[PDB]
Amino acid sequence: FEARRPKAKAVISEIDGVVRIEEGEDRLSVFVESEGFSKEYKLPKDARLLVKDGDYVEAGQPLTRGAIDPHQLLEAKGPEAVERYLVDEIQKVYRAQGVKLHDKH
């Protein structure tokens, strides 16, 4: 509800494109490449990812496992994507505690 930046934060793609993982050891990078862009996300080697070599990710989709910065999601995928993400992540917590409230609220 305060839209804060998580600590163990996931990295998301800002563009649509295909995934290309390049790792010479001690460093790791995930490339999201398209006809118009080839952007490299260099990640800490310890961090675990969600994308196979050759996957098609859309803009805003997370590349790693953590929580998503709602401001980074705002820029990449727009406001309605942040709304749905916040609701789902909020409703996750109450569901893990057995509390049932409607999504409207």
Q: Which residues are at the interface with other proteins (CB under 8 A)?
A: 50, 80, 83-84, 91, 95, 100-104
Residue keyed to tokens 């590349």: 63
How many C-beta atoms surround the C-beta of residue 42 within 10 A? 12
Could you give the strand order of the β-sheet that contains 17-22, starting from the edge strand earlier in sequence? Answer: 38-43, 28-33, 17-22, 56-57
- Minimum CB distance to other proteins, residue 17 (Å): 19
> 61 or 72: whose CB is closer to other proteins?
61
> 36 or 48: whose CB is closer to other proteins?
48
- Minimum CB distance to other proteins, residue 82 (Å): 10
> 7 or 104: whose CB is closer to other proteins?
104
> 27 or 85: whose CB is closer to other proteins?
85
- Minimum CB distance to other proteins, residue 87 (Å): 8
From residue 42, how far is each of 49, 64, 65, 80, 85 by CA, in Å? 12, 11, 15, 28, 25
- Minimum CB distance to other proteins, residue 35 (Å): 27
The CA distance from 93 to 95, in Å, is 5
